[PDB]
Amino acid sequence: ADKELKFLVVDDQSTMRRIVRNLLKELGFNNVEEAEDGVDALNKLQAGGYGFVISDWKMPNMDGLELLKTIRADGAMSALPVLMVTAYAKKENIIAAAQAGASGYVVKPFTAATLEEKLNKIFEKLGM
Numbered sequence: 001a002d003k004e005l006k007f008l009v010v011d012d013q014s015t016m017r018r019i020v021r022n023l024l025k026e027l028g029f030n031n032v033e034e035a036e037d038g039v040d041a042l043n044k045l046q047a048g049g050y051g052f053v054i055s056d057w058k059m060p061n062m063d064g065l066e067l068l069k070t071i072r073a074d075g076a077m078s079a080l081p082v083l084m085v086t087a088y089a090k091k092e093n094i095i096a097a098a099q100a101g102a103s104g105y106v107v108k109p110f111t112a113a114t115l116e117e118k119l120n121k122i123f124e125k126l127g128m
């Protein structure tokens, strides 16, 4: 993928945002911004130029499943890649996220190798 691709990393725990931002840097992606919940994320997205979203699920103000649905229903951003990264591991959560249009789903805790693999699977799927 394009190394200037602009990522938004969304999680209510700063620890996890830091993990994801550092992983992306190792992968050659330095154009990375953070948000603390779905509302904060939507505000950043509206400012424009984003090419990829990585999002938690459990967050105050707007949770990540609502964020994913909001993105998919909006004409300006409906095709935006969205990778879910969450501690929810039950099949019904995976199904609800997949059906709502998630590009990929990673269960926490995850390894560096798993994140890289799942990002690449999405790049290949979308011809990026």
Ligand code: BEF
Pocket: 056, 057, 058, 059, 085, 086, 087, 088, 108
């Ligand atoms: F809080 Be997340 F869904 F891991």
Ligand SMILES: [Mn+2]
Pocket: 011, 012, 013, 056, 057, 058, 059
């Ligand atoms: Mn959370």
